[PDB]
């Protein structure tokens, strides 16, 4: 279990992946990360599955509070008539690493954050969302770890990469876009920081990495965390998932549009607020 | 509504009391403040309705975290196998001050904190409790306010008292022991700090206050917040409510025992940890 690596996706598919191989050992399919039906009626707030932040489209920008932070603080009342009301259930899961059942198993706990906004001025609720998240510790810059992660936004492509050199460990494709990584630490989950990159850009990198790997025939090269950050332009990616609009940070390469109900128009990359 | 005063009790009876009179204008009966059935099985943690703190009886002492703080932080896992799992629903209530119904009404919001502990070593849950609380702002030392409050622990007796002089404004009796006071501020609730005193002691004060009021025939005198604090000894009161044990701070006068399943023995006042 210390060898395995947990991977969380937008459709609620937690995959237990062997870090070295990059393939899936077993998977847990449960409730999906972001479910926002109020955006169907009026889209105003834009959640972020990576941690739980919220953005507002009045133009696109980031808010000071996450959905979890807004749920715990709630109930409250705004200057505007709208009042906030949250709910935060805690579910746990236990399944044998092989699968009074078998002992020394793995106990995983997650959350159901659920925020709701009702405008006092109006006669109807003005927003609503349901955000899940796995309970795990904070990321630290551990020297024991020798990997890093690049994940496409809007597509389930993962590129695992040696921490120091950047040489590709494994590129893999999961059904739904990945949102978070967790490795087993202190008999529990510890979140692993990753780097969101544009799917177009990420695919573009993966091909050239194979091209340089073929021509040189020495090592398939992939950039380090800092190199991409300096080289690639930042962008705020907007996406959709089953009639639910979300936002996230992202990196684009040259030749990609980035902005400074028509769902699709707002979808894509925007300039970092 | 700015004239009225909200009063919360252990049986979930929020009373809207006129501050000057001290009598009840209307009441809202809902779910009670503290419901702890796990203490029935094993009593370990002792909640406090005044704000939500927890005490442990291994001897009697206070914990660093409240039930709300423990609910929001949860889920988690302790060094001992036991894992924590919380739930925090947010309910609101609107009733006309007279009672698309009548406008300019009062919207009151409360919470259902619900914490649970299950020992991994054991095969059964080790604790469980459900604590309510009304959503309201913090108390400030406002000069506009000219009152203070003494409440008995384990009995529903309230002694309202002029802030400066200490002269009794009104002594009143409510069915269930009061837990919190809220006054309408900024079109919302603002918590009002009160002073918990032993019922025996409080009754003792109320009689002598009437005695000095009769003999002198000038003013029924009651002590100020500081005088009682200096004069009266502190004690940690333990009580019960429908097979649920709780604890709270309290003040005792001379001639009252204070300690340095037999439910009843632990009930009463103990030395401040």
Numbering used by the authors:
A (entry chain A), B (entry chain A): 29 to 85, 91 to 132, 148 to 308, 356 to 368
Kindly provide excerpts from the paper associated with this entry.
In eukaryotes, the endoplasmic reticulum (ER) is the central organelle for the synthesis of proteins destined for secretion and membrane insertion. To ensure that the environment for productive protein maturation is maintained, both folding capacity and the inward flux of newly synthesised proteins are regulated by a pervasive negative feedback signalling pathway, the unfolded protein response (UPR). IRE1, conserved in all eukaryotes and therefore the best-studied UPR transducer, detects ER stress via its luminal domain (IRE1LD), initiating dimerisation-dependent autophosphorylation of its cytosolic domain. An alternative hypothesis posits that IRE1 is repressed by interacting with a major component of the ER folding machinery, the heat-shock protein (Hsp70) chaperone BiP.
The luminal domain of the broadly expressed alpha isoform of human IRE1 (hIRE1αLD) also crystallises as a dimer, with an overall architecture similar to the yeast protein, however, barring conformational changes, the MHC-like groove is too narrow to accommodate a peptide. Hence, it has been proposed that the structure of Zhou et al. (2006) represents a ‘closed’ conformation of the peptide-binding groove that can shift towards an ‘open’ state to allow peptide binding. To confirm these observations, we made use of an alternative assay reporting on IRE1LD’s dimerisation status. To this end, we employed a modified IRE1LD Q105C that forms a disulphide across the dimer interface, creating a covalently stabilised dimer when placed in oxidising conditions and the aforementioned dimerisation-compromised versions of the IRE1LD (W125A and P108A). Differential scanning fluorimetry (DSF) revealed that the melting temperature (Tm) of disulphide-linked IRE1LD Q105C SS was ~10 °C higher than the Tm the wild-type protein, a Tm difference that was effaced by reduction of the dimer-stabilising disulphide. To gain insight into the mode of MPZ-N binding to IRE1LD we made further use of the disulphide-linked IRE1LD Q105C SS. The crystallised IRE1LD Q105C SS dimer proved identical in structure to the wild-type protein (root-mean squared deviation (RMSD) of 0.46 Å over 227 Cα atoms) except for the presence of a conspicuous density corresponding to a C105-C105 trans-protomer disulphide, thereby locking the proposed binding groove in the ‘closed’ conformation. Nonetheless, a fluorescence polarisation binding assay, using FAM-labelled MPZ-N, showed that binding to the IRE1LD was not compromised by the disulphide, leading us to conclude that MPZ-N does not obligatorily bind within the proposed MHC-like groove of the IRE1LD. Our findings do not support the notion that this peptide specifically engages the MHC-like groove traversing the dimer interface, as a disulphide, crystallographically proven to lie across this groove, thereby locking the helices in a ‘closed’ conformation, had no effect on the binding of MPZ-N to IRE1LD.
